[PDB]
Design a protein around this nucleic acid. Structure first.
Ligand SMILES: Cc1cnc(N)c2[nH]cnc12
Length: 231
DNA sequence: CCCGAAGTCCG
DNA sequence: CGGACTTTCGGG
């Protein structure tokens, strides 16, 4: 069975505009976990738009197929384009897609893909269906996979006043002893972000609960101005 | 335009 | 450890 023609067309068009000179630093930035074609986001977006204009966006019946086929291509720009394409099918994504999104998180995993899946696609799903959080979050925290652990921390990133504080702090408590940078930093990020909504609660939490030094420092990067730094 | 959100390099 | 500094991206 041949590659979906939309994916084949995207692959041809991206490859025709590859930049090996830019690809080397782009790959280094991701610690050489991936090959790159060397195409940065503004051009990558336009090349995708070109193919949509010529071929049209595929029927929704092929949405998951398109994403998987792009996920399986070696160069990282194809996963970035896959995420761009998933946004175009946003109105068709629902709670039944959580396992599909899980599988994207744990394949070709790095912060650039995971941080574009979790606070947006998964965040929106669990905002609408909070009763499903406990069907996934405990497993993610218990898993050996640091990207599922990061997903548990960051899916509420953008919730603002809809933040479940008890849940957030319970999740952070479960993961606060992790020595993994991407967990310590995720804890720092979600606390820093939620502090924009409720600084008093974040300040009290970080002053009175154990956190990795990196997590605490990132959490209070801004709000330490509001409370001061005691001698 | 601005500002706020991984990486290297150094003490 | 944390500060200083870097480019790239998204949002205002
Ligand atoms: C995630 C992140 C944070 N801070 C910066 N100054 C960055 N530059 C590029 N990505 C960045």
């Amino acid at each position: 069975v041949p590659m979906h023609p939309f994916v084949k067309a995207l692959q041809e068009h991206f490859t025709a505009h590859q930049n090996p000179e830019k690809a080397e630093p782009m790959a280094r930035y991701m610690k050489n976990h991936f090959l790159f074609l060397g195409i940065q986001t503004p051009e990558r977006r336009q090349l995708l738009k070109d193919i949509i204009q010529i071929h049209t966006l595929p029927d929704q019946k092929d949405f998951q197929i398109i994403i998987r086929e792009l996920w399986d291509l070696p160069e990282r720009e194809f996963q970035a384009a896959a995420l761009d394409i998933m946004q175009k099918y946003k109105k068709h994504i629902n709670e039944t897609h959580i396992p599909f999104l899980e599988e994207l998180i744990v394949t070709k995993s790095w912060w650039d893909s995971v941080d574009s899946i979790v606070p947006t696609f998964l965040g929106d799903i669990f905002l609408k269906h909070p009763e499903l959080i406990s069907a996934y979050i405990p497993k993610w925290i218990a898993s050996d996979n640091i990207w599922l652990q990061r997903a548990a921390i960051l899916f509420q990133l953008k919730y603002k006043q809809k933040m479940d504080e008890e849940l957030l702090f319970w999740i952070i408590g479960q993961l606060h002893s992790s020595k993994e940078f991407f967990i310590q930093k995720a804890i720092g990020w979600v606390l820093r972000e939620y502090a924009k909504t409720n600084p008093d609660v974040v300040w009290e939490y970080v002053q009175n609960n154990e956190l990795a030094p990196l997590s605490k420092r990132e959490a209070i990067k801004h709000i330490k101005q509001n409370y001061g730094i005691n001698n």
